[PDB]
Design an enzyme around this catalytic site. Structure first.
Site, PDB file in Angstrom:
ATOM      1  N   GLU A   1      -4.438   8.487   1.485  1.00 19.84           N
ATOM      2  CA  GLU A   1      -3.837   7.349   2.181  1.00 19.84           C
ATOM      3  C   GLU A   1      -4.324   5.987   1.415  1.00 19.84           C
ATOM      4  O   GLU A   1      -4.524   5.080   2.342  1.00 19.84           O
ATOM      5  CB  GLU A   1      -3.768   7.049   3.607  1.00 19.84           C
ATOM      6  CG  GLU A   1      -2.671   6.439   4.416  1.00 19.84           C
ATOM      7  CD  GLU A   1      -1.275   6.811   4.017  1.00 19.84           C
ATOM      8  OE1 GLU A   1      -0.975   8.140   4.379  1.00 19.84           O
ATOM      9  OE2 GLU A   1      -0.586   6.264   3.025  1.00 19.84           O
ATOM     10  N   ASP A   2      -4.376   5.895   0.314  1.00 22.93           N
ATOM     11  CA  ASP A   2      -4.866   5.026  -0.723  1.00 22.93           C
ATOM     12  C   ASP A   2      -6.127   4.290  -0.399  1.00 22.93           C
ATOM     13  O   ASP A   2      -6.419   3.174  -0.619  1.00 22.93           O
ATOM     14  CB  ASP A   2      -3.696   3.598  -0.368  1.00 22.93           C
ATOM     15  CG  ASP A   2      -3.945   2.132  -1.440  1.00 22.93           C
ATOM     16  OD1 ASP A   2      -3.363   2.659  -2.283  1.00 22.93           O
ATOM     17  OD2 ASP A   2      -4.443   1.490  -0.938  1.00 22.93           O
ATOM     18  N   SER A   3      -7.228   5.224   0.045  1.00 19.64           N
ATOM     19  CA  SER A   3      -8.461   5.178  -0.060  1.00 19.64           C
ATOM     20  C   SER A   3      -9.373   5.544  -1.171  1.00 19.64           C
ATOM     21  O   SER A   3      -8.615   6.229  -2.152  1.00 19.64           O
ATOM     22  CB  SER A   3      -9.234   5.751   1.029  1.00 19.64           C
ATOM     23  OG  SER A   3      -8.521   5.329   2.353  1.00 19.64           O
TER      24      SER A   3
ATOM     25  N   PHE B   1      -4.332   2.738   4.329  1.00 22.46           N
ATOM     26  CA  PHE B   1      -5.857   2.148   3.972  1.00 22.46           C
ATOM     27  C   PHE B   1      -5.573   1.131   2.921  1.00 22.46           C
ATOM     28  O   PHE B   1      -6.620   1.159   1.868  1.00 22.46           O
ATOM     29  CB  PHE B   1      -6.790   3.243   3.743  1.00 22.46           C
ATOM     30  CG  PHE B   1      -6.994   4.048   5.269  1.00 22.46           C
ATOM     31  CD1 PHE B   1      -6.766   3.775   6.289  1.00 22.46           C
ATOM     32  CD2 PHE B   1      -6.708   5.565   4.873  1.00 22.46           C
ATOM     33  CE1 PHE B   1      -7.009   4.735   7.409  1.00 22.46           C
ATOM     34  CE2 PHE B   1      -6.654   6.428   5.731  1.00 22.46           C
ATOM     35  CZ  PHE B   1      -6.630   5.800   7.122  1.00 22.46           C
TER      36      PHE B   1
ATOM     37  N   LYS C   1      -4.143  -1.223  -5.581  1.00 20.78           N
ATOM     38  CA  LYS C   1      -5.235  -1.657  -4.715  1.00 20.78           C
ATOM     39  C   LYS C   1      -5.490  -0.426  -3.695  1.00 20.78           C
ATOM     40  O   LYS C   1      -4.961   0.561  -3.565  1.00 20.78           O
ATOM     41  CB  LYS C   1      -4.799  -2.737  -3.936  1.00 20.78           C
ATOM     42  CG  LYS C   1      -3.581  -2.657  -3.067  1.00 20.78           C
ATOM     43  CD  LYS C   1      -3.269  -3.831  -2.361  1.00 20.78           C
ATOM     44  CE  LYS C   1      -2.307  -3.771  -1.376  1.00 20.78           C
ATOM     45  NZ  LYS C   1      -0.926  -3.305  -1.842  1.00 20.78           N
TER      46      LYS C   1
END
Lengths: 205, 91, 62, 145, 62, 339, 124, 242, 43, 109
Positions: G54-56, H23, C9
């Site tokens: 960072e997982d964006s 995030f 995700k």
């Protein structure tokens, strides 16, 4: 192998307190023979102020630790002798410490003699030269005047310092009494060593 | 009850005295020299103690105060212009 | 929040116009740009194999 | 008991590294040192053994170290045991002293629970009320004035 | 997302804001946040938030 | 030189060696609580796919395949057995840590640094000095001590000054030598009552004294100074006096001027700082430093030493509880890697 | 996705109906029984400006405008009456009491706002 | 943010280490002090520069995370698969057009002059000269037998801000790296000055990748057919011993 | 319902109204990445 | 016989205290403001300036915070720091009075 360790480290404990032996030493076999026959072994020492300290070593299966009357009469007979007593050290097996009746005679003897320090200790407290243990920092009794100066500089009361029991093994080996002050020099991983002062409190038995 | 500082600290306090009219520094005369040390550290220039190059930092402070004053006056003129224009448009 | 079918995700962070997105020599441009650092620690290999298989399916029309 | 000391169920052999000052004053790492790491704790049991150095017995039990060595050695034991749990990505050393110095300031190893707070700080009712059970603390505070 | 006001609906009993976005109340500065602010030494911030902005009042004691 | 996956792991950006091996080579043995897959399926079978009392390693969680090659049904079930533990321990890493964190704070929060840098509970001392050194955790520098690992012969080779034949420098080396012995004696004892806490010649000190000397030498236009007997003797007197008045950093400049007696526990606090200064400001290491530059070094050392001191009224009990209860999250996360 | 095939007949709370859905180019057996929910977005696995750290993710604005992952989100308002006490109707300022500050009562038509108008914050 | 379509709290990725945040859908509170007393104390005490150095582990908290750790490696790498890792004057200036610091002077450079990544990094570290010499995370004796390490990439040395040799990676610029580049800057120049260099060095790492590229693919994970036979031959030895 | 039931648990008087607090002038939103902001800046 | 309570006991109002100021030469606390004390001084001065606004700062700033900071830095702040040392049972309150115009400011600007 408790009794063998006692036979050497009780004399090491006497020497560490700066006390002079009164009765000449005996061999270890004679010591265990007396402990088996009489039920206890008695050692005498005299302090610099000529106070007499008598240390009793009680066998695990002795009659004095199972029957309260035997301990009562033994303490009564020892406490009415013409000698300048100041302390009686009662070394017993650790389970004896859990016997309520024995502690009852101990506290009754304490009440009957308000000027004599009566203490009961287990075997394991006299099985090593406690000050020489690596894990144990260096304890040192300090005089009342030095403690008063330290507290006056720091605006402190004796009740505000850290407190250590009088039955604490290094405190026992020093000879500290409740109301005294012990300075402890201890290792540190931040300043390479540290110095604290603790206020000695009453023993746990 | 201090009486007299040392020649090194004498010239350092002379430097601070000259800098006082030039930077947010006020010299004191404590015995421990410590507020002076904090003032020099805060000014970003502790090199007076060993290196006699104080004059370049004096010029640096004069310059920085100059741009500070210039920017302040520019901002005041800009904001008064903005205020007058907003008053005009409100009317 | 958007996600792939491999459990990776993510949160939409930037919105670029069609002329600011990267493009291939053949004109292909991405809809989503995901960090390559999302993979090695989570080991979502099924998402990478899906892209490899799905890339040939589009041209083959299957 | 047959052929052993009570309290320990397994006794292994491990290799450990120590420093030692040579005859030339040099501090050298000695890697070929064998010791015994046991499962179960009995300081007094290994104390009496003639094959074990009694001066350098390292227990992992705070209560057993407190019982036989004292509160100062128990203070160093709390620091050591927390550090082992903390791993290597752990806090600074001064944060481990705060736990041990608080837990050992009364001469006994107090806990970080309701019973421990009642011993270090008996008269701080409001702090004691907030921690665990306000009703029990409030009732006791009223009767004790 | 949420951002409410300097004032709004108030709890009848405690005098504090209501709970969450749904009631148009404030957000919670819980137990762990007063620990952090105390650790940082932020005491005037605690007065501003826990007293000025939540339920601070004046108590009269003889 | 071109592998994106490898460059992410090799440079430490993201990933580790077991990640590439699992992706490319093979997962290997699934190990829960430092043991293989125990048989919970009807007395000796780990799963329905393997017979009772199976001897092959595959039946007990050994995954022979890699992720890029795909897993079979039994290998995926064993992988799910270990994968579920990560989800379970992650959930516990919040609640279980929170139970311990709250109890730690409510016991420790009353500890506040007073005006003596002591730690007390409203009257009652918890620490005679915060951290036994009186410093802040945010103001610490990791600095090596040179003399610790040196033998007595090479201690004299490096730190004994033979330029001036004076009894003063005999005491300087003797003080250097017995500080070396004191460090060894104390930290060898610390090694004794620990499992695997070895001696290190590296400490966390508030001031990096070596860097200050290096910084001033660079910015100074003076090169190799000529031999001057009085300047060398004067510098030694300056360093000796500075180490004697060093404990006054904990009190103020007023008592330093009055030379009032220093408490014993404050003399011990500056023991590491005294030791490092005498190592880095030894006569052999300050030959190319003027007497005026020496004043700058001494002024800069006690400026940084005072800046690192803990603040009055700092809630250090909350600081310690937060610092200790935070690694418990990772400790709980690794619950299935321990017996 | 298509959360329900009879969405227009339903008055549901906090429901999202994504307009466009695609069968995956790499489908599974689970799509024989349920409708796939998502789109085959072209994805680049690259470092581009550091906005996807960072997982964006970085999203094409054109993909957004064309209807990618776009839909309609629904909320419901269920208000009840007290029998013969309350009623539905537009209040008047000169009779009714403690009207809400900064409200907008003019959009009501016979007690309810008409269908198709845009209601914003503060509107009754 | 003047854009009316933005509803999120945006922050630098290197600032996530303070809050242990990411995030993936995290939400964070934000309140702006209004009282003068609380506004003063926010600037002086609670500023995030005061916790660049951790009060827990006494080490730095912030650094490069996941794109300026690998970006700094590529920027400081000695050799590129397309020759020596150099760039012309035009692309050397383009690395400093986002750092928001004062630009360096490129007047002593022809348009055809070539600058390596070490020179470009040096022009930024001259502002806060430090001294650093360690072995980067790039070098590992685990990889050594099967790799040809460059002798100028396994020794990261910086004296007075000049990157003499070596690469910059997690060991030097990574977050939480005790004794790292930003730990030395904080000790010598202040924690606020270290935070500006983290941002400044983050832009060179990201601006280098703007035309150097970095990607991961499925073939990056695929063993060659000959190496696959070697992997299972190793596993068969384990099953033979078992 | 009782007076002393309001005290004990997490939703009690002490841990929800005294040790914690509901405040005004506060905002919450999902966080996002932005590489053009300084480490001491928030969008 | 311990009898019924009297009026001598049962007082709730604590007795008043006498402020004992330690002489300057006998002070033990540091001659350097902590960050907490400097922050409190600046905040108090800024709030008072927001109330009154009367200052002797020669430079001009458009914010109370800046004026308070410059007053602290220029050693012109009209405040004192009283460090409570001990409250004695007999009634005395021994404190330390420190002048922030002659102590080292830990702040930076």
């Amino acid at each position: 192998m408790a009794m063998q360790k006692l036979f050497t480290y009780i004399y090491e404990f006497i020497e560490y307190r700066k006390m002079v032996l009164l009765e000449e030493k005996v061999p270890y076999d004679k010591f265990v023979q007396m402990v088996l026959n009489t039920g206890f072994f008695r050692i005498n020492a005299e302090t610099l102020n000529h106070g007499i300290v008598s240390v009793f070593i009680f066998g695990a299966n002795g009659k004095y630790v199972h029957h309260g009357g035997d301990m009562r009469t033994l303490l009564t007979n020892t406490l009415n002798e013409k000698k300048h007593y100041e302390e009686l050290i009662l070394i017993v097996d650790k389970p004896v410490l859990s016997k309520k009746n024995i502690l009852d005679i101990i506290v009754e003897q304490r009440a009957a003699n308000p000027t004599i320090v009566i203490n009961i200790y287990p075997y394991h407290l006299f099985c090593i030269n406690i000050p020489k243990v690596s894990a144990i920092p260096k304890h040192k009794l300090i005089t009342q005047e030095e403690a008063q100066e330290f507290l006056g500089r720091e605006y402190l009361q004796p009740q505000d310092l850290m407190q250590i029991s009088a039955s604490d093994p290094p405190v026992v080996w020093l000879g500290g009494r409740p109301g005294d002050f012990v300075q402890i020099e201890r290792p540190s991983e931040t300043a390479m060593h540290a110095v604290v002062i603790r206020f000695i409190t009453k023993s746990k038995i | 009850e201090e009486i007299e500082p040392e020649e090194n600290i004498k010239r350092v306090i002379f430097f601070l005295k000259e800098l006082s009219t030039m930077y947010s520094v006020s010299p004191v005369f404590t015995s421990g020299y410590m507020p002076l040390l904090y003032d020099l550290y805060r000014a970003g220039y502790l090199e007076v103690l060993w290196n006699p190059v104080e004059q370049k930092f004096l010029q640096h402070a004069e310059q920085r105060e100059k741009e500070q004053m210039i920017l302040q006056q520019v901002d005041m003129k800009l904001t008064e212009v903005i205020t007058q224009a907003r008053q005009y448009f409100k009317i | 929040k958007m996600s792939s079918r491999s459990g990776n995700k993510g949160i939409a962070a930037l919105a670029l116009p069609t002329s600011d997105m990267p493009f291939t020599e053949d004109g292909l441009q991405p809809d989503l740009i995901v960090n390559p650092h999302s993979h090695p620690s989570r080991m979502t290999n099924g998402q990478m194999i899906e892209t490899t298989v799905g890339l040939a399916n589009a041209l083959q029309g299957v | 008991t047959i052929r052993g000391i009570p309290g320990i169920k397994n006794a292994n052999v491990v290799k450990l590294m120590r420093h030692r000052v040579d005859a030339q004053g040099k501090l050298v790492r000695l890697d070929n040192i064998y010791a015994i790491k046991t499962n179960g704790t009995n300081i007094f049991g290994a104390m009496l053994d003639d094959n074990i150095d009694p001066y350098t017995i390292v227990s992992s039990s705070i209560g057993d170290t407190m019982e036989l060595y004292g509160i100062e050695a128990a203070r160093q034991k709390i620091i050591s045991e927390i550090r082992t749990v903390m791993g290597d990505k752990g806090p600074n050393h001064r944060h481990l002293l705060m736990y041990a110095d608080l837990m050992t300031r009364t001469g006994q190893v107090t806990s970080l629970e309701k019973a421990g707070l009642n011993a270090r700080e008996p008269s701080n009712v409001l702090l004691r009320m907030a921690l665990s059970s306000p009703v029990q603390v409030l009732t006791d505070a009223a009767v004790d004035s | 997302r949420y951002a409410v006001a300097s004032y709004g609906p108030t709890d009848a009993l405690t005098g504090q804001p209501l709970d969450g976005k749904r009631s148009h109340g404030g957000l919670r500065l819980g137990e762990m946040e007063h620990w952090v602010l105390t650790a940082q030494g932020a005491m005037q911030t605690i007065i501003e938030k826990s007293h000025d902005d939540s339920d601070g009042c004046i108590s009269y004691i003889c | 030189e071109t592998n994106g996956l490898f460059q992410m792991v090799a440079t430490g950006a993201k990933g580790s060696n077991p990640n590439m091996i699992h992706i490319m080579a093979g997962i290997g043995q699934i190990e829960i609580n430092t043991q293989r897959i125990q048989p919970q399926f009807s007395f000796g079978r780990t799963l329905v796919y393997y017979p009772r009392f199976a001897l092959e390693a595959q039946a007990y969680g050994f995954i022979c395949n890699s992720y890029i090659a795909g897993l079979t049904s039994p290998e995926f079930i064993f992988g799910e057995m270990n994968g579920r533990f990560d989800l379970i321990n992650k959930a516990l890493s919040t609640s279980s840590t929170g139970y311990a964190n709250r109890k730690a704070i409510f016991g420790l929060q009353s500890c506040i640094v007073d005006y003596y840098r002591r730690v007390s509970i409203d009257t009652r001392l918890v620490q005679q000095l915060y951290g036994e050194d009186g410093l802040d955790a945010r103001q610490l520098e990791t600095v090596r001590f040179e003399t610790i690992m040196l033998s007595d012969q090479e201690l004299e080779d490096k730190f004994k000054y033979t330029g001036i034949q004076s009894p003063l420098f005999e005491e300087e080396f003797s003080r250097l030598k017995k500080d070396r012995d004191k460090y060894r004696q104390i930290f060898l004892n610390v090694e004794n009552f620990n499992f695997s806490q070895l001696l290190t010649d590296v400490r966390q000190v508030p001031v990096n004294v070596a860097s200050i000397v290096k910084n001033i030498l660079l910015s100074s236009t003076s090169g190799v100074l000529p031999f001057d007997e009085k300047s060398i003797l004067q510098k030694y007197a300056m360093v000796k006096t500075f180490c004697k008045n060093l404990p006054y950093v904990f009190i103020n400049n007023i008592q330093e001027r009055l030379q009032t007696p220093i408490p014993v526990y404050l003399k011990r606090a500056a023991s590491l700082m005294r030791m490092l200064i005498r190592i880095e400001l030894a006569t052999v290491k300050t030959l190319n430093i003027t007497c005026e530059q020496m004043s700058a070094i001494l002024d800069l050392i006690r400026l940084q030493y005072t800046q690192s001191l803990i603040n009055y009224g700092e809630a250090v009990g909350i600081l310690a509880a937060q610092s200790v209860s935070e690694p418990l999250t990772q400790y709980m996360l690794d619950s299935h890697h321990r017996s | 996705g298509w959360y329900c095939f009879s969405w227009p007949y339903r008055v549901d709370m906090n429901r999202f109906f994504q307009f466009y859905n695609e069968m995956p180019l790499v489908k599974t057996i689970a799509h024989n029984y349920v409708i796939p929910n998502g789109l085959n977005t072209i994805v680049a696995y690259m470092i581009y400006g550091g906005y996807n750290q960072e997982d964006s993710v970085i999203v094409s604005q054109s993909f957004i405008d064309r209807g990618g992952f776009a839909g309609t989100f629904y909320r419901e308002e269920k208000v009840e009456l007290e029998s013969d006490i309350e009623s539905f109707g537009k209040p008047d300022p000169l009779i009714t009491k403690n009207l809400k500050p900064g409200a907008n009562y003019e959009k009501l038509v016979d007690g309810f706002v008409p269908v198709g108008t845009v209601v914003k914050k503060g509107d009754i | 943010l003047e854009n009316p379509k933005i509803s999120t709290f945006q922050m630098n990725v290197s600032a996530c280490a303070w809050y242990n945040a990411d995030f993936d859908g995290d939400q964070m509170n934000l309140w702006v002090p209004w009282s003068v007393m609380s506004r003063v104390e926010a600037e002086l005490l609670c500023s995030v520069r005061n916790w660049f150095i951790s009060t827990k582990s006494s080490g730095p908290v912030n650094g490069q995370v996941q794109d300026s750790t690998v970006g700094s490696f590529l920027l400081t790498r000695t050799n590129t698969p397309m020759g020596k890792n150099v760039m012309n004057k035009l692309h050397a200036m383009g690395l400093f057009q986002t750092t928001q610091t004062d630009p360096p002077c490129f007047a002593n450079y022809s348009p055809t002059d070539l600058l390596d990544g070490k020179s470009v990094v040096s022009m930024l570290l001259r502002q806060t000269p430090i001294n650093y010499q360690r072995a980067p995370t790039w070098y590992s004796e685990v990889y050594a037998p099967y790799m040809h390490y460059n002798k100028q990439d396994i020794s990261t040395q910086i004296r007075n801000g000049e990157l003499i040799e070596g690469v910059l990676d997690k060991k030097a610029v990574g977050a939480g790296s005790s004794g790292g580049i930003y730990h030395l800057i904080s000790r010598r120049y202040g924690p606020q000055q270290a935070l500006k260099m983290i941002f400044a060095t983050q832009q060179l790492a990201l601006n280098y990748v703007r035309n150097a590229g970095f990607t991961v693919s499925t073939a990056d994970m695929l063993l060659t057919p000959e190496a696959h036979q070697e992997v299972q031959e190793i596993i068969n030895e384990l099953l033979l011993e078992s | 319902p009782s007076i002393m039931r309001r005290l004990p648990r997490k939703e009690g008087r002490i841990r929800k109204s005294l040790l914690g607090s509901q405040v005004w002038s506060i905002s919450r939103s999902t966080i996002c990445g932005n590489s053009d902001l300084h480490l001491d800046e928030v969008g | 016989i311990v009898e019924s309570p009297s009026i001598c006991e049962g007082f709730v109002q604590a007795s008043s205290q006498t402020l004992v100021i330690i002489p300057d030469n006998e002070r033990i606390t540091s001659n350097v403001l902590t960050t907490f004390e400097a922050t409190r001084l600046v905040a108090v001065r800024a709030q008072q300036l927001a109330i009154n606004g009367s200052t002797m700062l020669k430079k001009k700033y458009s914010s109370p915070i800046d004026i308070a900071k410059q007053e602290l830095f220029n050693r012109k702040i009209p405040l004192l720091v009283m460090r409570c040392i001990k409250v004695t049972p007999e009634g005395q309150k021994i404190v330390e009075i420190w002048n922030p115009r002659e102590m080292g400011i830990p702040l930076l600007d």
